[PDB]
Amino acid sequence: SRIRAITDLIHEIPTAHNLCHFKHVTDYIDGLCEACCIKGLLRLPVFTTVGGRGIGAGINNTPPFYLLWHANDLAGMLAQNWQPWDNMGIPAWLGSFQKESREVGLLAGMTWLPRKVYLHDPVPGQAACCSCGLPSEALVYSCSIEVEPVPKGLEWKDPHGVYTDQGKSLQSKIK
DNA sequence: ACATGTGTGCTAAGCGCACCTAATTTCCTGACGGCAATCCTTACCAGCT
Numbered sequence: 346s347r348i349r350a351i352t353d354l355i356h357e358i359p360t361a362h363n364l365c366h367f368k369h370v371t372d373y374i375d376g377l378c379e380a381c382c383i384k385g386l387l388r389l390p391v392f393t394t395v396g397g398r399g400i401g402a403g404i405n406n407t408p409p410f411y412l413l414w415h416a417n418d419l420a421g422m423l424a425q426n427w428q429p430w431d432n433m434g435i436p437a438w439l440g441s442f443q444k445e446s447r448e449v450g451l452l453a454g455m456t457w458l459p460r461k462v463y464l465h466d467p468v469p470g471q472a473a474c475c476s477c478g479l480p481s482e483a484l485v486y487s488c489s490i491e492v493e494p495v496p497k498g499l500e501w502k503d504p505h506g507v508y509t510d511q512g513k514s515l516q517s518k519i520k
Numbered sequence: 521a522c523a524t525g526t527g528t529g530c531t532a533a534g535c536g537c538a539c540c541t542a543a544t545t546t547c548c549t550g551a552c553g554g555c556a557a558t559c560c561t562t563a564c565c566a567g568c569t
């Protein structure tokens with residue numbers, strides 16, 4: 346039911362702010378290709394912010410600092426960050442996840458869904474890029490978003506996250 | 521910012537100072553006043569176009 350602009354999914358592109366104009370963008374007008382939409386959906390479970398204290402965040406109240414091991418190789422990247430935990434979880438690429446008991450696991454929190462995304466496609470679409478830069482085919486128009494209120498409790502520690510001693514997520518301190 | 525306009529015709533050398541001397545005390549300020557805003561929302565709802 347709730348429909349927002351697809352430009353708010355990719356946080357770098359300005360959205361329907363409280364302004365008559367934006368940084369030379371306009372919602373429901375500028376196209377966006379499949380690749381950037383799809384790699385912008387990967388930023389939902391891990392980099393979702395507060396939407397005015399009534400719209401919920403991700404598995405953390407604020408997007409935490411992420412510390413992580415880098416390597417020259419993709420095999421080296423995957424191998425150097427292999428530290429597992431005994432819990433399994435339920436990742437979102439399965440169907441509806443089972444709530445069950447608390448401490449849901451690791452693959453469940455890696456693929457947590459704070460917001461439903463459905464998307465919609467009109468009678469074909471565009472003919473060239475207008476916001477991405479890579480000239481693609483008929484692009485998408487807008488996205489659909491809703492809010493899942495994350496239930497209270499849910500004791501969960503992030504493998505890459507940086508956590509305060511009081512349990513709140515640690516945000517970057519740049520103003 | 522010496523020279524130079526001499527025009528009968530304009531010198532010149534020796535010589536130029538040493539020494540004692542300069543002080544203290546204390547005094548020195550309290551108080552009151554010190555800016556607010558606005559540069560992303562628990563967002564729908566009702567005054568009315």
Ligand SMILES: [Mg+2]
Nearest residue numbers: 378381477479
């Ligand atoms: Mg692209």
